[PDB]
């Protein structure tokens, strides 16, 4: 009925917990699992490869990291559907944390050594570019696409991108603000990061936070706790409401490169993102 | 009448939301909109052009980026504009968000390559000096002259500079604080931002926030969500009043620059800013 | 197992102090103490030895950073555990501090010098890659596993690895997270940090902190003062409960690595860090089974 | 006549506000105001010169950048002076801004170019040790002198400096703290900062606020808003009173340097600052 | 007799302030102020020396920072001295201040030059690792003797060392927390802050706040304001209590060092700190 909040259900199980850990999406698949066939770069993209001319820009689809999504089922509320108010599982706080940072202390592998004057030193550890964003909701996370350059030659299978969506090749409107340009985050590693971000039109069901460091040997930075509670309430104390029994986890967690022995070539570092979300019933007309 | 604040009106439509999105000018117009006739340049700079001497300073004007405006109506109010008591729109707060900085991520590309050498590694990403500026008031945001050299000759015709107003040439006081350089945002794309800053002496219907951060390869940095709500209000719980019924928006967001593989040609690289106001009608005097 | 907490226990010996520091656990264990043998790295990792190829990654033991952590005992409470209400201790709270960081202004050592033209200016002192966490439970921390390379060859004996839990090699999902891959912080110097990481899943009676600055020559940061208190109480006033008696202390707390003039070979760095923890009596609802 | 501390005043006029912006004083004086003749460097101070030995370091003064300062009247009061009450001018309150740090996105001059090879890239911006300080005080800002070196031979003519208040030349005390080094801040464009800070020992009746960012090359940071007020009441709610009846304001704000292409010869940058400050009337016995 | 703290001491004399500055140990001490002689290198060390091989490292002792202390007297308190009740003098709060950072704004000295090519630019100024510690309390600050290198030849005399504590050589334990390495800030300039730290299993009267950067270049950073109260109560609201009537100030301030044309030799600097201490009287048991 009309979209009216109410009260908080209350009585035996009108709150509830959830939780989730969704695995980056830098570029490699999880599949093959061999680690001699491309598996031991699962967590990690493969390869960048460079444009070869300013109008010939043709990056692999496993060099772009995309984001991670979930969509998670939550318990039955409403048996009859016609009643003038019903009941909705609505989104509280969350509890999410980067997993897995120490393992950037391993500097004893086969990167670029710190001294290459006599390859000598420490396994140069990841820099760079850093990327974390997530969001939980009621509805996919609404995505608005702006890219670097409308003339990039993107992959048409394997990867969705502002062209998958209007049928068309990309305008320069798309290098900034281009309305038309609007997609919804409803599959998990096939919206690639550079391309898609939060819609801030939309999302009025959802609420995302994002963070971005750019450069190329800038240090990573990053805390964990379990401790620390995200309240995903508005300024009137409601938070995301699931209209379709469903909840929406979306995510994308790049630390930076690390980078070969053989002409530089560098690698996407992503690591998980776990989530814990605290839900109750909410009676809405 | 008088300028006296007092109550808050009540009743139907006495609230309102205002949504708009502000993209960058950094130089290159919106058309031609064909990518290899120029658009491709679109929501970033021509290349940078430096002085070829001491005294010979002439920047393109596509190489200067400028402020971003909006002028948006509001639904109208008073039916007897003569009567002692009249109602004026104000705004409470602002969520405002930069979008398209995981944009920055594309380091596939052909720019400067990090391995200079041997010409391999990645495309150098975005970085350097940033600027960040968004105001929303009553009236055009009033702006104050200064500049890094008064000897500089910009163009006398597409862009308004000092000289644009005073019909005279900069003297040397316009490199510090001449209170006879003033201005107002009353176009979009035509006021550069290393001439026209915030009135601090003035902007008494208008509330404006920016920050800057120099340097040459400074790593950029962003945060961005839907949560985040930046009040208006000013100390006595008055946010800024629109004494003609047209809500102005105005801002700036630079990133930084990309650098070419063709003598470090530098080209400024913008974000477009989304706004979403809330407004209130206000009984005045 | 009703985990149902009560009031708070009032009256004599109701709350309590616990102290304790726990030393690093870099590389070099504690012995050999002679400053000749090998003594002189304690408080260090030995020189980090880097693969020789693409599929050859052997770390040596005395290289890898592991785990702190100590088990300490509480005083009895609960003579018969099948009494309907019982107590138990409960941490409020913990004034924790890193110990040592002016130690680093040394710079007047034998380590690659600044002016490397002339062999001069100051020895370098330590930098680059920083790693700060400490916890506090009524259990072990639990542990995830999650690594750079499932392809290291980690010793199989002097630390506890993925495969010492598993009894297998590791998949190419530890690179990633991987249910499986799942310890409990019991053995103080055997846990890696770049293996082990605190689990997000778990550790209902433990509280962590963490963080991380990479690089490598990024200055190190720290502060240190007796007036900050770290509140162990969630968002129900509820502090860590301890089951058995037993207060878990864990930490591991990197400066980063100094530099010899022997061709870059890097050791890590590690300080000491000091814990006092606040206690309390809490009644409780017989949790036992 | 006793610093009692009473009511505030209320009534006609007991409130008032005053307005005024500092120029810098980096080294190059106002005039002339030729931009041939010096006037160029308005708003910079003039080619650093460096010492030529260990024992011969004496800085030319249109290099050192100086205090700003301006002693502003405040309207009349009391009609009869030999009464126990009187009334005194309270400072609350000050919002004050650095305005001009777009200026510094110039990047299209002659200074040192970033790609040295070629003599391309972009002119180098503004960076390098910043330094911001501010006060509003009843008195002029207390100084305690404090050197780098007691050696510095520093002009003896056009500044004051501490051997101009001792008569007498410095001692190795002066490079740490000497209770004997002190001044008050009485002139603008006089004081170098290099040698005058405030005085944590006096400075009864002034607030200051300063920050220092050193470094060669460390990118200069700036924030600028038109909604951000500084408190200037004490932990007993009283702000500095004017017994003289002469508002005092203080401020220096370097930004770093700029490079030109001739041996590195680097020039001091400076921006002006603007005051709001907000006063009431108090009783004072 | 028994430390139970009862109700804050009313009337006359019951509150007190004591200021005082503490000057910095750098190395150098204040004589012989010759600045020929040596003066010219008060407030800071004298050149850093190397060890010559990996078991030979002789540090000179005026090589060496070491911790500033002052013991101050407070006015008299209890007559009547075999009381139930007493009075004691209790630290409430202290302003404290790091003084003459802009003395670093010195770029035209001597120093190694920025750009070594031409022996042009400027005068590099004091950069790398800072350290700030102050403390306040009843009892001198209790110290725990760490050390980078258990082997380190310190000398036997001029400077206080563990050997000087323990009268036996360090031992391997001394790299990390060793028990037995105890000591307590009796003496001004003569205890290392290389070697002794903060005890935080001690100190119950005394309240200590340090911080600590890195690095061999990295920027100083130091802010200053007489607006800033330090808060020296602890969680039930007692603050350190002078046991003995005498009040222990205790301080470090590390700025960075500079280096010279000769062989790239760094001085340490330091910088004094001023203290605002307000004390009043407390009824103890
Ligand atoms: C397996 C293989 O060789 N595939 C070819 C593609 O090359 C691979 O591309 C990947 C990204 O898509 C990675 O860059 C691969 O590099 C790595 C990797 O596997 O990650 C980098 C690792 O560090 C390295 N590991 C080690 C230990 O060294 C591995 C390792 O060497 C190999 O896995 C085993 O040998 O390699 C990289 O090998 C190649 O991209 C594609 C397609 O090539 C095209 C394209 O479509 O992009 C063909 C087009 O016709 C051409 N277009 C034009 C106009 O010329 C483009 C163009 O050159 C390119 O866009 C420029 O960048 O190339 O072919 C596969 O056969
Ligand atoms: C097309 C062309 O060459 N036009 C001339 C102008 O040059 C262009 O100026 C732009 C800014 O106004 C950009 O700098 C252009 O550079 C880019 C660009 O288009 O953005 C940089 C891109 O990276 C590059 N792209 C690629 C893929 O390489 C493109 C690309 O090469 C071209 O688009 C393809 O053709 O180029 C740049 O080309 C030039 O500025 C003007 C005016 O020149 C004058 C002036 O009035 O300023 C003439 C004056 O007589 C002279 N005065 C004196 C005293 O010397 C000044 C002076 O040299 C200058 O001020 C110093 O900077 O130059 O002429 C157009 O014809
Ligand atoms: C005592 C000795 O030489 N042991 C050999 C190992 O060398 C030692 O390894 C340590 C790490 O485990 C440190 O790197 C040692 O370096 C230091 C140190 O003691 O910490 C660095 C100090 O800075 C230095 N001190 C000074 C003042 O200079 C000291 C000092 O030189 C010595 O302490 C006294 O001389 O040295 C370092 O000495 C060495 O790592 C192993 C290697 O053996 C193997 C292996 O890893 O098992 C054998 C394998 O068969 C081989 N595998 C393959 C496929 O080749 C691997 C492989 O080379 C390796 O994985 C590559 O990294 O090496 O041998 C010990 O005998
Ligand atoms: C006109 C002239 O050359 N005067 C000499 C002085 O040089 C000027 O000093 C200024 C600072 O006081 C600036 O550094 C000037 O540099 C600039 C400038 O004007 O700002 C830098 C600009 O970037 C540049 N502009 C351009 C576009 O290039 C301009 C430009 O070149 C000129 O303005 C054009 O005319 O130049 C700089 O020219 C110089 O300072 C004095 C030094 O004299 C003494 C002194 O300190 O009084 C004499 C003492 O006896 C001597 N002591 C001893 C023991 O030798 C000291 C000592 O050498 C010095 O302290 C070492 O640093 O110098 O001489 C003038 O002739
Ligand atoms: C005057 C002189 O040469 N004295 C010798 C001592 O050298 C001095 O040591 C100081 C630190 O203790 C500084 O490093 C001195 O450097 C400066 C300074 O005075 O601060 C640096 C200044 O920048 C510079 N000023 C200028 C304008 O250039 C001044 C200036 O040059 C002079 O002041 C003017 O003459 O110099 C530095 O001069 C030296 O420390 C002592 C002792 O030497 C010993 C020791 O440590 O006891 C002797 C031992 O026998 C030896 N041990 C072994 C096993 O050989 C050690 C060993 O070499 C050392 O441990 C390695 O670091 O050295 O001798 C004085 O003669």
Chains 1, 2, 4, 5 share one sequence.
Not at 21 to 48: A, C, H, K, V
Not at 142 to 163: S, W
Request: aromatic share 8%.
């Amino acid at each position: 009925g009309g979209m009216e909040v109410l009260d908080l259900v209350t009585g035996p199980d009108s709150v509830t917990e959830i939780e989730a850990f969704l695995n980056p999406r830098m570029g490699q698949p999880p599949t093959p699992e061999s680690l001699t066939e491309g598996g031991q770069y699962y967590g990690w993209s493969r390869g960048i490869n460079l444009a070869t001319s300013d109008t010939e820009d043709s990056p692999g689809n496993n060099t772009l990291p995309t984001w991670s999504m979930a969509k998670l089922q939550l318990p039955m509320l409403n048996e009859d559907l016609t009643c003038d108010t019903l009941q909705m599982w609505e989104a509280v706080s969350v509890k999410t944390e980067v997993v897995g940072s120490g393992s950037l202390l391993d500097v004893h592998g086969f990167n670029k050594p710190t001294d290459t004057v006599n390859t000598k030193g420490i396994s140069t550890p990841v820099e760079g570019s850093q990327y974390h964003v997530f969001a939980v909701g009621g509805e996919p996370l609404d995505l608005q696409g702006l890219v670097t350059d409308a003339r990039t030659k993107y992959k048409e299978e394997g990867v969705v991108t502002i062209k998958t969506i209007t049928k068309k090749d990309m305008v320069n409107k798309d290098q900034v603000l281009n309305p038309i340009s609007k997609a919804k985050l409803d599959k998990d590693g096939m919206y690639p990061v550079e391309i898609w971000h939060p819609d801030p039109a939309k999302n009025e069901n959802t609420r995302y936070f994002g963070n971005y460091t750019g450069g190329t040997t800038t240090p990573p930075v990053l805390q964990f706790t379990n401790t620390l509670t995200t309240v995903l309430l508005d300024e009137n104390g409601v938070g995301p409401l699931c209209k379709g029994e469903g909840l929406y986890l979306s995510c994308v967690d790049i630390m930076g490169w690390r980078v070969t022995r053989n002409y530089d070539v560098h690698h996407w570092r992503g690591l998980p993102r776990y989530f814990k979300i605290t839900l109750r019933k909410r009676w809405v007309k």
